[PDB]
């Protein structure tokens, strides 16, 4: 997320035993990084 110039990153790692779809459980995500970059971001792409 980008809020008032703050780029906030949240994440959680959890095991699974299925490759069909996403598990129907419930899990909260903790904050990990908060970078005060202040950049106008409108587009993105991933790198594999």
């Amino acid at each position, epitope marked *: 997320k980008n809020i008032d110039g703050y780029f906030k990153i949240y994440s959680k790692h959890t095991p699974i*035993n299925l490759v069909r779809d996403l598990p129907q*459980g*419930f899990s909260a995500l903790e904050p990990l990084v908060d970078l005060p970059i202040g950049i106008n971001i409108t587009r993105f792409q991933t790198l594999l």
Partner: antibody
Amino acid sequence: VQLVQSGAEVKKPGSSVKVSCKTSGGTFNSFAINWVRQAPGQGPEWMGRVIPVLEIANYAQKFQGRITITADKSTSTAYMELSSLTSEDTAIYYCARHHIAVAQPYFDYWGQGTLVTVS
Amino acid sequence: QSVLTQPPSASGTPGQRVTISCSGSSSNIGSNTVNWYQHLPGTAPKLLMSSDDQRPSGVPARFSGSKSGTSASLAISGLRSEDEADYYCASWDDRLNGVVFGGGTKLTVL
């Protein structure tokens, strides 16, 4: 409301059985239907559920493609199909409803149950 | 077998309190909530406690629950004769991706 299901069924091993659970009119949309069985001398165990508005289904892992759950919107009835019946398949089957806007399920209202015996 | 461990039987005297414990593991009890049910043979079950601290709409002031670590307990005060029934504890299991139920207990009142 109330959920009314089919009566007791008696059937032979190796075949399939079909069980219905008729419900009210307003109990679709933001409401899911869950199936729970209770073997004699055993606790309840969950089989699966279906959300009629999204026509998506979930199945228990230890049922490896043995259970099928379907429903029709026009009549507002849900169907249960179980094949490859064996001697150990004897149990009592329940139909129960769930509210969809809650993270972990909590079954709130239950049917009176139907008994299936195999001999 | 039930992933949640529960004593098979419990007994109590009229007018006093009795506590029923339901023990699980970190994967299910340590991560999810517990639910309590009543069952009378020949009828349909009911709700006693939801979300581990939230009382349902109908049940009278009497049934009480608490949770601690990987175990949970249900406390009944002002016991009366109509309380004779079967109690169940249930919870979600993240490792199994399904609902797991306990074995149930039978309460007897002298």
